[PDB]
Subunit: 506 residues, 4 copies
C-alpha cells in the first residue's frame, strides 16, 4: 500500500481500504500549487494590513477587528484547546485514521489556507500508525472531534500507538515530529469540517454493504433449505418493474443459486406451492435496500472529497468568503437513509428464520432439530433474532430532523449528523446477529436434506460456517455457535461470493 | 389536454399534470399488440387444459387445481368483493384519478393478461370524470384500495361525479359503460399492484417540491429582511463541496436574489456581522433536501411505469411466472425519504422566523411591530410556526421498518408503503403553514425598511401576498392572514419564481 | 342535567359526561367569595398606584411600567386579537365545550383576578350551546386556542350554533349577551392556561377507556371462538404477580366469561394444548395498558381542576406572583403514556385476529369461511387490521421530548402537549377498526360452532353486532360490515358490559 | 450487610442497595413452608402418575405426554443449554447480582415448585460474589439471560470472580458448591421470568432518580448564577395546580435555595425581569418527570417481588396452572415511561446551559469567560450538551409498541421489555453529561459574581466540583473538566443534598 493522493479524488473503494487497514500515503506533486497559493493569499492579506473574518480577526466583539499578529497565533491554540470538549468513549484507531485521511484530503484541495507542513504532520501521524484520541460524542454536525484530533499536533492530548496510549510528545516523536505552532486560519481549517460525521456514516455504509452481501448468500441458502423456487428471480419480472436496485439484486440471486442444483432438482414439481414473501419478495425488498445504500453512498462519496471548513480561500481571485460547508445535513440524511436499509435487511432475514422454524412451511422438522419432543433446537435462537430485529425499528428514528440552537443563537440550525451515523453501527450489529442465526439455520436445514448439495457458491457458504460450527445433533450450549457465526460475518466470510460491480465500495 | 399514452413512458411532469387536473387519455396504437398477446397467451392456456397458478386455478387448497371455467368467472367477482375491505375517509378525486391512470399505465404494458376492453373501461371512467370511492386505509403495500376502485367496473360500490356520489350503475352510465364481467386473471391484475402506494407518495413528492420552491423564495425574502449577505450563495463555495443538490440550490438563490438589490445596497458594509446558519447554511440544508426529494422521485417515477401485479404473463415465451412486484418496499423508503426533506424544509424555515422576531439579530423591531410595548405583533404566529415544525419530528418516524405477517403467514413481510406516503400530506400542511408565516414575516420586515425594494423576483413574491394580506400596522385578528398566506402557497403562488429544470416534475 | 359547579372538584365521570353531551351549568354559591376577592385585590392594586407585572403593566420594554388605565383596557383586546393565530381545522363542538368548561372551572377557583361577569359569559355560551370556533393547531402547550375562544366574548371571531356558523354578535345574542370589554389581567387569565391541551388528552383518555372496555369483550369472544382456556384468568396467578392493572383486568375477563359456557363445556379436554399469548397473556398486556391509562387519568383529572393561568392572585395575602402553571408538561407525558396503551390494545387485538385466520391454531376453517377454495372470507379484513395496528407504532413516538425556543428565547422550553393529545384520536380510530374486525371475526367463528352459545355477557356482544351485521356466508362486499362494526364501537355498544369501578371515568 | 429475606417484600431502597454494592443474604425461616410445599405438590404429581403440562411432560408433540422420569431430568439440562442463546456484551456484575437476587426472591415465594437447595445455590453464588456471565441481548421479554445465568448451577458456562472469568466448576468451588442436576419443573422455574427485564429497568429507574436529584441542585445553582427569582417556587402556585410531582419538586427547590442568599440579596429589585421558562417552569417540568419516574417505580417495585415463571404451583389447592406472568409488558411501558423523564430532565438542563451562554439573558459575560475576544470559554461545551440532549429524542422512541411472533406463532405477542430498559442507560449517560456541563457553567458563573455565596446546600454543590475542577480563567483543554464533573455525578456527589422521602428508592 502506497497511496499517492490526488486530493478530492478518493473513490469509495479507496475509502473502504482506508477504514479496513493501515495506510501509507503521500501527497501527489500536483496538489502543491493550490495548497501553497492558498497560504500565500492568506499571507498577502496579513502583509497588506487588510481585515478578513476568519483569517486575522478575533471573534465576538472583535469579529471585524484585526487582532495583532503577536497574539493571532495564541488564538490558534486557544481555539483547539477550548474546542476539544468532546465526551464518551474513544473512537477505535480505524475510525481515527479514516477521519485523519479525510481531513488531509479536504485541506489538500488547497482552499483552506493552511500550510503544507501542517498537512504533512497529519500524514506522518497516519504513516507512523499514531492515532489521536477522539471521544465519541460532542459534535452536532465536527469541532469537538477535530479539535481533539488536532491537539496532538500542538503536543497536547494523547495518542494511540501499537494499542497503547502515548503522550502527545512521545507520539509525535514516534512519527518524527515535534510540537507545532499554528498560523492564521489554521485553527478554523482543522476544526471546521464534516470529517467526523462523514467517517461515522461511511463506517455505517461499509457495514450495510457487508450485510447486504451476506443477506444475498444467507437468503439463497434459506431458499434451498425450504425447497423454495428460483422463479421469483427471473430477469423478466425485474425488468418489467424497472427498479435498478431490484434488477441487480435478482441478478445476484441468479448468480449465486444457478439455474438449478442437486437439492432443487430433487423436488420434482417445485411449483406445487407459492413461496412466502420472505423468500419470493427478496429482490423487491433487498432491491429497495440496495437503492437506499447507493443513494447514501453517492452523497457520502462526494462528502469525503468535499472542502468542508470555513472561511474558504479562493487564491485565483484573491477572495476569502464565509459560507457554510461545515453544515453536515446531507450526511445526516444519508445516514438516516442507511438506517432504513440496515433495518429492513434485518427484518426480511428474521422472517426467513421464522419460516425455517415453522414445520407447516419449512418442510423441515420443528425448530430444525431431529427428535423435537425432548430437544428445543433453534427455538430460542429465533427469539434472539427477533430481539435484535425489533431493536432496529426504534433505532431507525431519524436524527436528521432534530436541531437545537447553539452558540447564543448564531448556530441556530445544525445537522446532528454524528448521532445519525453512529447509531448505524449498533443497527449493523443487530442485523449482523440476525444474519448469523439465519446462516446457521439454513445450513442446519440443508444438512437435514441428507447428502444433497446446493449451488457452487452456496456450498462455499455452508463450508465456511461448517469449518467453525458443527451440525446441531441434540441440544447443546447455543450461544457459542451464534458468536462464531457473527465473527465470521464480521470478518467478511461471505462478502467475496457476491458478483463484481454491485455495491458502491466493492 | 389529450394524452396519447405510450404505456410505461409517463414522465414526472405528466404525473404532476394528472394529479393537478382532469385528464383526457387514449391508448396509443403501439400498446395493442402486447396487451392482446397477453390475453391470447392466457386464452391458449385455458384452451389447452393446462394449469397455471393465478390464471385458471383456485386458491388455498385448490391452488394447483384447475377450477372449472363455469365458475372461474365467479371467482373474479368474489376476489373484488371480498378484497374491498378498506376503511376510513374517501380519497379525493384527484388521488382517485392518479391511481386509475397508474393502473391503466401498468396494465397497458401488456404483461398482466387483462382484456383491452377492461382497460378501456378505466379510461372511459377517467375521461368522464367518474371517480370510484376509495377508502384511505387498508393497504399494507394495494388490494383494498384497488378492489374498491374495481367494484365500479362490476356495477358495485359507488362513484363520484361533479362532486356527488352516484350509484355504480348510474356512474357507469355517465361514462357510457354497462356493468362488466371479469375473465381469468383479471381479478388479480386489477387488485395486485402498487398504484395506491405510488399515488400517495407521488402526492407527497409534489407537495415537497412545491414547498422547496416556496422556501427558496421565502428564504430569499428573509435574507433581505434582516439585511443578510449574498456571499454564502457564491458558486465557488458550492462547487468546492461537490454536492449537486447544494450547487443547484445556491444557483436558485442567486437567480432570485441577484448580485444586489436596493435594500442590500443600503447596507454600506454588509460584512460587519456573520449571518446565522438559518440563512447562511440555506444551500447546504435545502441542498440536502433537494437530493432527498430527487432520490425519491427517481424511485417513484419508475414505480409509476412499473408492471406491479402478479402472476406476470410473458407471451413472447409462453410463460406465466409468479413473482413479487406487488411488494411496495422501494415506495415506502422513497416516502420515508421525503418525510426527512419536508421536515427539514420546515425546520430551517421556523428558525428563519425565530431570527426575524429577535431584535438582537433581526435589525428590526421586536416581533416585527412598531410600538411593541402595547402590541404583540408576530409573537404568537411564531409560536404557531414552532408547533407545526415540531409535529414533523414525530411524523418523520419511518413506516418502512415495520411489518406484520398477514394471510396466515404466507404474506410474511409487507411494505407499509401506504402509511408511509399518506403521512407526508400532513407533514406538508405543517411545513406549508410554517412557510406561510415566514412569508408574512419577511414581507412585514421588508415593509419596515421604508420605501426599499428587493430583487425583481422577490418583489413579485411580496406583491402576491400584499394582494391578499395588508401590512400589519397594529394588533388585529392574526388567524386570517395565516389562512390567506397558506392558501396562496397551496395554489402555487410562489412556484413559478424558481428557475427551470430544478425539481423533478417541474 | 344541571351541574352546580364547585370549582376545582370536577370528577373524571363529570368530565366524560361533559365531553359526551350538552351541559347546563351554574356556579355554586361558595365560589363567589374567592372569585370576587381576587378581583378586589387587582382593583386595590390599581387603586393604590402600585405596579404588578401581568396586572397593570405593558410588556417587552414596558414590563415594569404602569401603562395608563386609559389604554390598559385596549391592551386586553390587543392580546386576544394578536394571540388568535391558530391554524387548521375547527375543533368539533364537543371539544369546544370541554375546553370552555375547563376554562370556567380554573378561573372559578378565584386565583386569576377575572370578573365574575366574564366567567358567567362563558357559562351562558355553554348553556345556549354556542361554541366558539377554535382551530386545531397553534399551541405548543394554549394561547392560540384560548384566544380564538375568547374572541367571541369581545364580539369578534365566530361561533357554531345548531351546526351553523354564526357571527359573534348573533352568537352572543343567542346566549343573551352583548360584546364584552376586558379589564386588567383578564386577557392573560383567558389566554394563559392548559385547557386546550388537557381537553385534547382527556378525549384521548376517554377513547382509550372505550377501547379497553371493547377489547375485554372482543378478547373474551375470541377466546371462545378458538376454544381457548379460562385458566389464564385464574385469580391466583394475577395475585402472585401483584400488578393491580393485571388483577383488575383478569377480574373483568372472569366476570364476562364465567366459570364455563356451552361452547367451552363442549371441549371435553380443553387442556390438550396451550393457548398462544394473544389470548393467554391478555391479563398481563391489557393489565399494563390499564395501569398506563390510570396513571394518565390521575394527572389529567388533576389538570382539569388546575389553576393554570399566570400571574396568580393570592388575595388572602395581597400577593400577585408570576409562576409557570401554563407549562403543560405533565399533560404531554400523560398523552404520550396513553399512546402506548392505545397502540398495545390494538397490537394484542390484531394478533388475536391473525390467530383466528390460521387453521393450524383456530380450529376453524381457513379465513373463517366455509368453502375456502373459492371464497377469501376475512383474509383482506385481517390485512386491514394489520395496516391500522402498524400505523400506531410510528404514531406512538413521543411529542413530550421535543421543544423549540419561542418568543425570542424567553419561552425557551415548551411542552408540545397539544400535538401529544391530538395524535391519540387517530391512534384510537386505528385501534377502533382493529377491534371492529376482531369483533366481526370472533362472532363469525362462534357462528361456525353451530348452535352453541358463549356466556351471558358475550352473547349480548354477539347480538349487538348481529343486529347490524349478518353472518358471512359466501364472499360479499366486505367494507360495509367493518364500517358498521366501527360505528357500533364508537357509540359505546360494548362499553356497558364491563363491570363497575374499573376504568377511571366510568 | 446481612439481608434476611422475607420473599416478595423487597423495597425499592433494598433494590438500590443491591444494585449498588455486594450483598450477603439468607432466606428467612418463614419462607421454607411454602417453598417446600410447592416441591411436595410437584413430587405428589409424579408419585401418582398424573400428567401436568410444564411439570412432567415433554413439549411440541409430547406436550400432554408424561415423559419418563428416567429422562425428565435430561430435559432440564437440554432446556438450559438450548435456551442460552444470548448475544452481545456481558452484563456487569452489579446487574448480574440484581438479576440473581430477583430470581431468588421470586422463586422463594414458593409458587414455582423448585427445590430449596437450588435456591440456596443462587444465594451462595451471591454471597461468594460469583457472577455468572450473562450476554446483553436475546430476550424479547427472559429465557436467554436466565438460562445463561443458570448454566453455572449445572457446571457449564462461566463466571466472574474478583474481576476474572473463572470456569463454572472453579466458580462453583469458590462458592462451596458442586455442579447441580435439575428436577421436574426447575428448568422452567429458572428460565421463565421477568428478572432480566426488571433489573434493566430498575437500573434505568435508579439513574433517573440520581439525575433528578442532580438537576434540582444544578437548576438551583443556575437560578443563582443568572440572578433568577425564587418566586416561581412559592408553595401557593404549586398547590393551586394540584400536581403532586410538581408540589414536591418546588418543595425541593425551596429547601435547597432558602428564602434568600447573599447573591440574591445583592439584586435590590429582582422583579425587574421575568425569568425564562428553563428556570421559572422548573417545578412544572421537573414535576412531570418526578411523576413519570414515580409511576414507573410503582410497577417496577411490584415486578421485583412478582412470581414471574410458569406454570405456577398452588400447593394449598393441589393445582398447577399455566398462565402468562412471564410477559413483561408492564416493565416495557415502565421503561418507556422513564425514557420520557430522562430525556426531559436533559432538555430542561440544556436550555439552562444555553441561557447561561447568552449575554442578553445571563447578566454574565459571553460564554462565561472574561476577555471573550480571544477566548471561547464554554462555547463548545454547550455544543456538546446540545449533542447529548438531542440524541435522547430518538432514543425515547418506545420499544413497548413493537412485537414479533416467535416460536412458530405460539409466542405471538411479546414485550420487548429488555430493549426498553437497556436504552435508558445510554439516555442517562446523555443527561448525565448535560448536567455535568450545567454544573460546571453554573459554578463558573457564580464565581464571576466575585466573593458572593449561594445557599448552604448549593455552596456544598459548588465545593464538590471545585475540589476537582478549577475556575476557568482563560482557554484550556476543556474535555477533562467535563469528564471529572460527569464522574462526580455518577458517584452520587449531588444526591445527598435532596431532602428526604422524595424519590422512590431514596
Amino acid at each position: 500500500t502506497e497511496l499517492t493522493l490526488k486530493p478530492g479524488t478518493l473513490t469509495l473503494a479507496q475509502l473502504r481500504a482506508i477504514h479496513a487497514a493501515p495506510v501509507r500515503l503521500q501527497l501527489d506533486a500536483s496538489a502543491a500549487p493550490a495548497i501553497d497559493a492558498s497560504v500565500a493569499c492568506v499571507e498577502q492579506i496579513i502583509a497588506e494590513d487588510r481585515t478578513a473574518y476568519g483569517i486575522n480577526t478575533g471573534f465576538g466583539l472583535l469579529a471585524s477587528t484585526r487582532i495583532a499578529s503577536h497574539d493571532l497565533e495564541n488564538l490558534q491554540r486557544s481555539l483547539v484547546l477550548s474546542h476539544a470538549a468532546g465526551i464518551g468513549a474513544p473512537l477505535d484507531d480505524d475510525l481515527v485514521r479514516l477521519i485523519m485521511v479525510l481531513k488531509i484530503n479536504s485541506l489538500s484541495r488547497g482552499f483552506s489556507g493552511i500550510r503544507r507542513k501542517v498537512i504533512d504532520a497529519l500524514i506522518a501521524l497516519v504513516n507512523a500508525e499514531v492515532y489521536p484520541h477522539i471521544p465519541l460524542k460532542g459534535s452536532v454536525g465536527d469541532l469537538a472531534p477535530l479539535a481533539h484530533m488536532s491537539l496532538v499536533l500542538l503536543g497536547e492530548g494523547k495518542a494511540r500507538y501499537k494499542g497503547q496510549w502515548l503522550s502527545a510528545t512521545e507520539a509525535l516523536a514516534v512519527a518524527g515530529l515535534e510540537p507545532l505552532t499554528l498560523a492564521a486560519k489554521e485553527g478554523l481549517a482543522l476544526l471546521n469540517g464534516t470529517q467526523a460525521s462523514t467517517a461515522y456514516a461511511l463506517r455505517g455504509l461499509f457495514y450495510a454493504e457487508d450485510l447486504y452481501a451476506a443477506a444475498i448468500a444467507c437468503g439463497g441458502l434459506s431458499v434451498e433449505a425450504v425447497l423454495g423456487s428460483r422463479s421469483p428471480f427471473d430477469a423478466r419480472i425485474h425488468e418489467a418493474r424497472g427498479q435498478r436496485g431490484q434488477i441487480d439484486t435478482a441478478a445476484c440471486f441468479r448468480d449465486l443459486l444457478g439455474d438449478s442444483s442437486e437439492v432443487s432438482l430433487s423436488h420434482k414439481n417445485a411449483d406445487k406451492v407459492q413461496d412466502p414473501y420472505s423468500l419470493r419478495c427478496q429482490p423487491q425488498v433487498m432491491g429497495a435496500c440496495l437503492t437506499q445504500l447507493r443513494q447514501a453512498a453517492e452523497v457520502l462519496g462526494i462528502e469525503a472529497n468535499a472542502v468542508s471548513d470555513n472561511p474558504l480561500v479562493f487564491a485565483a481571485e484573491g477572495d476569502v468568503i464565509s459560507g457554510g460547508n461545515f453544515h453536515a445535513e446531507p450526511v445526516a440524511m444519508a445516514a438516516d437513509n442507511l438506517a432504513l436499509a440496515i433495518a429492513e435487511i434485518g427484518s426480511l432475514s428474521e422472517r426467513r428464520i421464522s419460516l425455517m422454524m415453522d414445520k407447516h412451511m419449512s418442510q423441515l422438522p420443528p425448530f430444525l432439530v431431529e427428535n423435537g419432543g425432548v430437544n428445543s433446537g433453534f427455538m430460542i435462537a429465533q427469539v434472539t433474532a427477533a430481539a435484535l430485529a425489533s431493536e432496529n425499528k426504534a433505532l431507525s428514528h431519524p436524527h436528521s430532523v432534530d436541531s437545537l440552537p447553539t452558540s447564543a443563537n448564531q448556530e441556530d440550525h445544525v445537522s446532528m449528523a454524528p448521532a445519525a451515523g453512529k447509531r448505524l453501527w449498533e443497527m449493523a450489529e443487530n442485523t449482523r446477529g440476525v444474519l448469523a442465526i439465519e446462516w446457521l439455520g439454513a445450513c442446519q436445514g440443508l444438512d437435514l436434506r441428507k447428502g444433497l448439495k446446493t449451488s457452487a457458491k452456496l456450498e462455499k457458504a455452508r463450508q465456511a460456517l461448517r469449518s467453525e460450527v458443527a451440525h446441531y445433533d441434540r441440544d447443546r450450549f447455543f450461544a457459542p455457535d451464534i458468536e462464531k457465526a457473527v465473527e465470521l460475518l464480521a470478518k467478511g466470510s461471505l462478502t467475496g461470493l457476491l458478483p463484481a460491480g454491485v455495491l458502491p465500495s466493492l
